[PDB]
């Protein structure tokens, strides 16, 4: 829906990011693909055969951009949030170690 | 006045036998003086972040204790130098050392006490005379340009019992005293002023007069006002160095101060090279513009705390001009990396960092930045005032809008004028991106406006309108061709480059294109808009049947017209004057309405 | 093809050849200094006159309440009277009343040109102050002035800051 | 934090003394001899603290009690009236104006709504722009010609002021300002320029009696 | 001097991983080097890292193992780490201790220096002009390396960087239209990489030229810390006070990186972003800013960073904190290897923002820019025409189509492809370039000026 | 009250950060006021947030800046901060501390309250059940407001969230077909937003009871985690002890959230989401929940708690925790916003949790709450459509689709669009939510039943 639901991980960043560069390069490939098939489809203007093809490549275009891109973006964005997210709280536990232990060592003066 | 050191765990110095210190103090570490604050106190024993290196530094040694906290020192001579982020000059270190280095532990005077100045008194103070705080007791005449006037410093008031009479007086001299409760207070031409701490002012007032910068695009489509805040993006091909010299070379404003934060060793010495090397026509003559101008260098590896400060350190001198009734433009080349910087310091300290790695206040320190910009009323009671502008820049990583800094930044600012890079790989400059860039301050000045040229208001109006369309028709162009396209939709789209030809675009290095003075701006705006309001007429009038107009037709019919309206650039204000560039512009104004009423 | 780097080895290592053996002239000379202190040590006057400086440096340098001076036994009655001398002169200058004793069960190996070592009372803190060292120590940090002296300055080095 | 305005308790009542030791200083500076009777009497309640030794306390203290006027945008516009008063005289002081023109510029000033604002205001910035260039200005065509239409600018404000328009004085603002900012390396165009307004002027002899 | 006799003490109050806590010290020094006599005979050395009051806490430089708290002796030195610097240093091998493994002598000293140095004050500072000529086309004729800039060379692990790094050595030079040094550091590399690079630089006659400093990934981790500093400290006493242009190449910055970390650790200090110090930043600042020129002065320094990305991602901190602050990037790419073409770099991608001032007349010939500005703009469309091609297949490209891809086969063969002893001056990278511009007839050339192309074009 | 004399000390133990650290204090109290004076006469107070022993930790509002360990004297009021509240507060200013500064003198108490305050007994609590006016359709119709409701605005940087706030002031009335008093607590604001407020109060001629508590941007920080209580303790003085209606608005909860996230940076507490405290809701909840009615009394308290939404995320602890609070929010959005639509009111993400039972006989209309519900409907699938037309193109959509792409287009200009100074009625927002409605036929109106649908639908 909103999000592909893989758990926030440096796995799902590598994953996300090579599935969002192969997202963009289909996206370039099949707009070539379309632009050819605008060139030869107003040149003629086996016709209707074009006219199929170039909805049908330019609707799958559309969807790449308005709907699995967008979504993989937004999945990334995700991921990056909450992997910070856990760095702090191992942030605050290390701090208050760190601050225990100085603690401890005033004692035993 | 003296400590000692107990123990140093890096750069961070534990003192003992320190009882008598405030918090962010100053303290001068070791037997070589290096510069640190105290942060953490407790007892006789405080915590000392060092600025500089502490290799070397032994338990036991001295560390002297100095009253004031982080302060800039302010007073004649501040002119035309080249200060460190916590105002060490460069210019001096380098030139009384002979040596290539900032010395470890370095101490030279702000200002230098051995340069005998002319001060003249204000000739209306005598000795007994009530004097308050703000008040100007004389003027040290530095240059030509910019008389530096000196202020009592703030937060001191009495009775006048000494003035100095007219003579050559050096920054270690007494030149006003002044008696409060019988406390007698002796003062020099320096004045000492804490960083951090914002100078008062009698009252904050609206910005209403524009900044007159020497760009036809952000002027006439986003308009800055003097006390104004904006945003400028940073990035190596947007371009910026054509807002940063327009700025210092032919802006209204009085002082310039340009402010480093933490950039590369490269890109400082090309502001260093560059900016001596600047001149301006003032009263006929051509002047540097390092005798109005004041600058604070600061390399990605000078302490870390003093590319923190620079910020704060440029501003401080921002308000101290400020206060003199003149008019201040501040540049920060890049307040990322101050943010970057600062959040090295949070890091340093152990502090719990918050979004994206930055500090919690991250948002609140850049707000109190901007908050300090602004038209006043000054101090003092020559009733006189001025204004401090921020055009500082942001250089976010990966040039994204995400980056704390940047989103906070853009929530800070009035005005935005996003740069890009697309424009310059296409040789058109300035880089003004147009549809990202923006203005708030359209409404402020719409009373000096009215005022004063009357058409200004709606001719960017329609001209916005005349860019907007051009993209919003972008679509339809691609799909059809300008085939099955409407006429005029056509005028708009070739009217729209117009624009963007021989308008929005600018060349810097041409001598007639150098400045364009508003009223040259709005004059060559106007005619544009009088010419697109004519042709859409043109074709609407004529469009129901039989015989119609169209756009081609216009072109073939007042080609001559075309043309004259793009060689409007081309009126030098240096060779032709005001009467005769509106004479000229009139001219066309009457050649166009005549060619289209010749088709109807 | 090899010929290139048959002499690119051979002139490598003879100007490996060459820096060793300037650096065996540094060393002949650090060796004939400690010959040359070998005589001065020899003399009765002027190496009382050294002693008396060393077991000052000594003390004011260990800075403790009780100090053990070390020798050479053949030395004792010099180091005597150096340590008389020394003790009263350190406490005017550091007003602290310091038991400074002479190890005389203990003392340096014969084979040292002279010089004393100063420890502590518990004998954990030790003072490197044997003639030999202090020489050592000399010669390494004045070694920059020793390359010009005997073999000219460097020709390219055009700014000493 | 009372933080009244910008200014804290101690910081606004320091500035209402000062404002009040500088109007005193003002009105004798402008008028020395108290021959403007009706201007100094809008001022008496701010004059009548002078002359009065309070060592900065006293009066201080007035202020914080109340006795004294503390308000202080009251104070703000009409020191600021006044000390344009001494602008007006001050950057003419070469002649002299007369007495009932000096009365009369001030009630044009008390009238206005916003002084600061104002078409006087800016030609006094003007006015002052062209007489601080020649305090310490190289013998030069330019120069001289800056300074003989100076002194005939000083000249005709003593006489008409500067509320009054007059076309006249306007121009020569215009021409004086446009010469100002005339580049130092031409010459012919600063030449023809004053030529212009020497043989333009409507009287024969445009600098006699005007400068030596 | 100092001639004040030293203090050794047996005093520990005990031993901690890296760490020797140490008592009783008089008056200690932050960062003083001190000597350890462990109870076998054995040295060692160290360095001090706190001293709160008379308890200096010392790292040890190597491993701790077989110290004990009552036998151990420390030898305090008075001083801190501060290197011998001399010409004559030149040509040799050192370790990252400063120690020669060159079988020759120890450094006869000219000066000594703080390795930490001081900053360079920016009003002396002179923006870079002329071109250092790399001798490998891929960085001469199309992201040139100004004299005084710092470039950076990205490259992922598995990749030839060292070989790269190498080849610069042996070819790099002054355009040439005996004042030019080369200084080398390499942090956490392998035993065999190590061989590589002294022998490699031993037999091809550079060493004359090269000061060569080897941290080995099996050294200790605080000694990978000063190398860099001890090359930039050489490199500065080289350039500034000897009057000469030097090229510093630093290696495997992220294997420091690490090291810092590490580092970090052992001062007890809690990690900042992906586990790295907060002052990452200022800590390479502090190595990369030493560099560039000054004035009045004719010497230079330049670096050459090779950076190793993690997982192959230039978000990365290193990369990103190091290019943040550095002018442009090489990047060396993964693809162009698996092709099986040397050096493997990516035009595209790469950008050296102070070519514009590197190159021109007087500095290395008049159609330097042009020849630079067209290449790249046919590269990338002969890219974009291959991609096409995937498509739509040969027959449905034009004329204008297949010259691009003509361009783009003949260019990448000819032009990026060269071979690590093939030593191309900037004069001929040029010269190659132009056989592939002439491919196209000149209406196709819209980068290059017609007065630039009348001139060189033809022949 | 308190007659015993109060103690001063000069036995500040220690400074870190904001927090001074007293010892050798007779009997802390927890959470009262210590006021202390700078060796340069400086006068600061703080609140004491931890006692121990004889020590105890102080909180400065104004900054730790310039504190010493010395000479600092501090005095202990021996209370928490009750603070001076009277009727006539209104038209006064004050700034973020609760000090006069528009000249005027210090408060004259009728009493002195806690700036905690009290939670209110849930059991004479009484539900809300009148609804306020607000003339903006886009509210009045779809998310009503009642009186006593707590009703944030969600907005970004750059939007009118001010000019929408300040209309809802003017123009907020009664559906009964009445003076409120505005407590505007302007905090982490510029001077011109404070300005534009202060100066749109004048102009709607409401002054004499409006109630200006400041504090800027350039203001400290940790005052601003009081303000709004002040603000909120003489909302409750007028609204429960004076039976005056009362409208708080605080503005840019965010500030208020930045705040207090430095305050649990500062004391080292648990972070829960993005650095802020995990007592987060809890600390709000004190803030939100000082509203609504009290039965037996005349009076109310209504919210506006506008805030900001950090980099437009929903999701972010502010809004996030806030939305869990109040009863719904407005939330404006930037896609209205950049196609100059005014007020640019979002209703699809938006809800009002009192609207089920403010509404229909007796309220407004009986049809009221059919046309909201129906509204949503379309307006939601309108969105879906466009949704789905992006990719598929206009051509594939069937007239169930135009339909709706039709009611998107005319209700957002129609219904939403009013302008800064069109008020429009509660009754004329439902004739033009069924003007919208009959664009589709009956039978899609699936939300309305026909009962309702055979009245209102013909006309």
Redesign the interface.
């Known amino acids: 829906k909103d999000r592909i639901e893989i758990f926030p991980s440096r796995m799902a960043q590598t994953i996300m990011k090579a599935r969002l560069k192969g997202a963009q390069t289909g996206r370039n490939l099949l707009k070539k693909k379309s632009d050819a098939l605008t060139l030869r489809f107003r040149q003629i203007l086996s016709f209707v055969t074009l006219d199929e093809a170039i909805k049908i490549t330019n609707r799958r275009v559309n969807a790449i951009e308005h709907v699995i891109i967008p979504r993989i973006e937004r999945t990334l964005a995700y991921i990056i949030t909450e992997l910070d997210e856990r760095e702090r709280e191992e942030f605050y536990r290390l701090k208050k170690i760190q601050e225990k232990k100085k603690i401890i060592k005033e004692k035993s003066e | 006045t003296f400590g000692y050191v107990h123990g140093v765990s890096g750069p961070v110095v534990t003192a003992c036998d320190m009882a008598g210190a405030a918090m962010y103090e100053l303290v001068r570490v070791g037997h070589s003086e290096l510069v640190g604050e105290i942060i953490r106190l407790e007892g006789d024993m405080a915590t000392i972040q060092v600025y500089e290196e502490t290799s070397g530094v032994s338990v036991g040694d001295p560390v002297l204790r100095t009253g004031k906290p982080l302060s800039v020192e302010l007073g004649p001579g501040i002119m035309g130098a080249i200060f460190d982020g916590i105002q060490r000059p460069l210019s001096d270190i380098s030139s009384q050392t002979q040596s290539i280095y900032i010395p470890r532990g370095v101490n030279v005077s702000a200002l230098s006490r051995d340069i005998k100045w002319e001060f003249i008194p204000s000739k209306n103070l005598r000795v007994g005379s009530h004097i308050t705080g703000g008040d100007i007791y004389g003027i040290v005449n530095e240059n030509s340009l910019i008389k530096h006037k000196i202020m009592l410093p703030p937060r001191s008031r009495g009775s006048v019992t000494y003035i100095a009479p007219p003579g050559n007086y050096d920054a270690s001299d007494v030149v006003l005293e002044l008696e409060f409760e019988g406390v007698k207070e002796k003062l020099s031409m320096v004045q000492v002023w804490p960083v951090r701490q914002v100078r008062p002012v009698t009252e904050k007032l609206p910005a209403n007069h524009p900044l007159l910068t020497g760009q036809r695009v952000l002027d006439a489509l986003f308009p800055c006002v003097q006390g104004g805040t904006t945003a400028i993006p940073g990035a190596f091909g947007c371009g910026k160095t054509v807002i940063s010299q327009s700025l210092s070379k032919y802006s209204n404003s009085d002082v310039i101060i340009y402010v480093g934060c933490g950039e590369r060793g490269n890109e400082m010495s090309e502001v260093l090279r560059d900016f001596p090397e600047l001149t301006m026509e003032v009263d006929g003559k051509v002047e540097s513009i390092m005798k109005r101008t004041a600058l604070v260098a600061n390399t990605s590896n000078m302490p870390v705390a003093a590319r923190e400060a620079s910020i704060y350190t440029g501003i401080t001198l921002s308000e101290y001009f400020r206060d003199m009734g003149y008019h201040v433009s501040m540049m920060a080349d890049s307040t990322s990396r101050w943010a970057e910087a600062l959040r090295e310091i949070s890091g340093r300290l152990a502090e719990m960092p918050a979004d994206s790695g930055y500090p919690a206040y991250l948002g609140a320190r850049l707000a109190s930045f901007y908050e300090r910009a602004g038209r006043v009323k000054c101090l003092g009671n020559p009733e006189r005032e001025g204004s401090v502008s921020i055009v500082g820049a942001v250089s976010p990583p990966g040039g994204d809008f995400s980056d704390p800094v940047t989103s906070a930044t853009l929530g800070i600012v009035q005005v935005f004028w996003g740069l890009d890079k697309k424009l310059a790989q296409r040789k058109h400059f300035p880089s003004v991106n147009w549809l990202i860039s923006y203005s708030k301050y359209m409404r402020a000045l719409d009373e000096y406006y009215d005022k004063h040229f009357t058409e200004f208001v709606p001719l960017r109006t329609k001209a916005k309108e005349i860019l907007q369309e051009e993209e919003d028709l972008a679509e339809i162009v691609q799909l059809v061709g300008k085939a099955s396209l409407a006429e005029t939709d056509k005028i708009t789209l070739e009217v729209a480059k117009l624009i963007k030809d021989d308008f929005l675009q600018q060349n810097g290095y041409t001598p007639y294109d150098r400045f364009c003075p508003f009223y040259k701006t709005v004059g060559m705006l106007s005619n544009m808009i009088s010419f697109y309001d004519m042709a859409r007429r043109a074709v609407e009038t004529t469009a129901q049947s039989d015989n119609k107009i169209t756009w081609s037709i216009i072109r073939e019919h007042m080609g001559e017209i075309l043309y004259k309206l793009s060689s409007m650039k081309f009126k030098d204000p240096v060779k032709d004057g005001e009467a005769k560039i509106k004479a000229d512009y009139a001219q066309l104004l009457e050649d166009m309405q005549n060619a289209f009423r010749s088709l109807e | 093809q090899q010929k290139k780097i048959q002499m690119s080895n051979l002139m490598n290592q003879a100007r490996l050849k060459v820096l060793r053996a300037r650096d065996d002239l540094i060393t002949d000379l650090l060796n004939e200094a400690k010959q040359r202190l070998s005589k001065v040590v020899k003399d009765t006057t002027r190496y009382q006159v050294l002693l008396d400086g060393l077991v000052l440096q000594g003390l004011y340098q260990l800075l403790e309440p009780r100090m053990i001076v070390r020798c050479r036994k053949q030395d004792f009655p010099l180091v005597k009277a150096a340590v008389q001398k020394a003790i009263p002169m350190y406490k005017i200058a550091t007003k602290k009343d310091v038991d400074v004793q002479i190890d005389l069960e203990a003392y340096l190996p014969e084979d040292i040109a002279g010089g004393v070592e100063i420890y502590n009372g518990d004998r954990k803190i030790k003072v490197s102050n044997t003639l030999e060292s202090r020489l050592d120590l000399i010669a390494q940090q004045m070694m920059p002035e020793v390359r010009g002296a005997l073999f000219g300055a460097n020709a390219n080095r055009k700014f000493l800051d | 934090?009372?933080?009244?305005?910008?200014?804290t308790s101690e910081?606004y009542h320091?500035?209402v003394?000062?404002?009040?030791?500088?109007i005193a200083?003002?009105m004798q500076?402008i008028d020395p001899e108290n021959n403007l009777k009706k201007i100094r009497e809008d001022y008496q309640d701010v004059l009548i603290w002078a002359e009065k030794?309070?060592?900065?306390?006293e009066?201080l203290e007035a202020s914080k009690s109340g006795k004294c006027p503390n308000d202080?945008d009251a104070l703000?516009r009409r020191?600021?009236i006044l000390?344009e008063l001494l602008r007006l005289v001050s950057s003419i002081s070469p002649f002299k104006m007369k007495l009932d023109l000096i009365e009369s510029q001030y009630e044009k000033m008390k009238q206005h709504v916003n002084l600061?604002k104002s078409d006087y205001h800016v030609k006094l910035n003007q006015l002052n722009q062209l007489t601080d260039?020649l305090k310490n200005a190289a013998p030069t065509p330019?120069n001289n010609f800056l300074r003989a239409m100076t002194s005939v600018l000083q000249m005709q404000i003593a006489q008409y002021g500067i509320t009054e328009d007059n076309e006249g004085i306007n121009q020569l603002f215009k021409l004086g300002l446009?010469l100002?900012?005339?580049?130092?390396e031409k010459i012919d165009e600063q030449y023809h320029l004053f030529k212009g307004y020497v043989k333009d002027q409507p009287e024969e002899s445009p600098f006699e009696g005007i400068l030596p | 001097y100092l001639s004040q006799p030293r203090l050794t003490y047996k005093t520990v109050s005990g031993v901690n991983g890296p760490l020797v806590i140490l008592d009783h010290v008089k008056f200690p020094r932050y960062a003083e080097i001190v000597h350890l006599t462990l109870p076998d005979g054995t040295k060692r050395s160290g360095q001090v890292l706190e001293v709160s009051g008379s308890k200096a806490v010392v790292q040890v430089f190597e491993g701790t193992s077989g110290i004990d708290a009552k036998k151990t002796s420390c030898e305090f030195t008075g001083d801190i780490l501060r290197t011998p610097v001399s010409e004559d240093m030149l040509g040799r091998v050192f370790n990252g201790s400063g120690k020669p493994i060159d079988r020759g002598p120890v450094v006869l000293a000219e000066d000594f220096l703080d390795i930490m140095g001081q900053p360079i004050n920016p009003q002396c500072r002179i923006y870079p002009e002329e071109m250092i000529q790399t001798g490998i086309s891929a960085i001469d004729g199309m992201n040139s390396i100004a004299r005084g800039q710092k470039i950076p060379i990205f490259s992922a692990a598995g990749l030839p960087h060292n070989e790269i790094a190498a080849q610069i050595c042996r070819q790099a030079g002054l355009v040439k239209k005996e004042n030019f040094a080369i200084v080398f550091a390499a942090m956490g590399v392998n035993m065999e990489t190590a061989r590589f690079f002294k022998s490699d630089f031993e037999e091809n006659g550079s060493m004359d030229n090269v000061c060569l400093f080897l941290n080995l990934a099996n050294d200790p981790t605080i000694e990978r810390i000063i190398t860099p500093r001890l090359a930039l400290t050489t490199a500065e006493f080289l350039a500034y006070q000897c009057e000469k242009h030097v090229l510093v190449i630093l290696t495997d910055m992220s294997s420091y990186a690490e090291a810092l970390r590490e580092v970090s650790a052992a001062r007890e200090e809690v990690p900042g972003r992906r586990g790295f110090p907060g002052y990452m930043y200022t800590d390479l600042a502090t190595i990369y800013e030493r560099a560039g020129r000054v004035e009045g002065r004719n010497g230079s320094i330049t670096q050459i960073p090779i950076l190793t990305m993690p997982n192959d991602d230039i978000t990365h901190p290193i990369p990103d904190l190091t290019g943040y602050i550095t002018e442009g990037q090489i990047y060396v790419d993964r693809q162009l290897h698996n092709r099986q073409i040397y050096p493997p770099i990516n035009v595209l991608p790469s950008l050296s923002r102070l070519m514009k001032s590197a190159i021109g007349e007087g500095m290395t010939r008049k159609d330097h820019a042009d020849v630079s500005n067209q290449l790249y703009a046919c590269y990338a469309i002969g890219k974009d025409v291959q991609a096409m091609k995937a498509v739509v297949g040969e027959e449905a490209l034009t004329s204008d189509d297949l010259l691009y891809l003509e361009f783009l086969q003949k260019f990448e063969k000819n032009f990026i492809t060269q071979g690590p002893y093939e030593n191309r001056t900037v004069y001929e990278t040029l010269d190659i370039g132009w056989q592939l511009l002439r491919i196209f007839p000149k209406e196709m050339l819209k980068r290059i000026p017609q007065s630039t192309l009348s001139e060189f074009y033809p022949r």
Not at chain 4, 53 to 57: I, M
Not at chain 4, 180 to 184: I, R
């Open positions: 934090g009372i933080k009244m305005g910008g200014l910081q320091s500035q003394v000062g404002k009040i030791g500088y200083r003002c500076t030794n309070y060592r900065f306390e009066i202080l703000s020191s600021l000390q600061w260039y330019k446009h100002l900012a005339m580049a130092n």
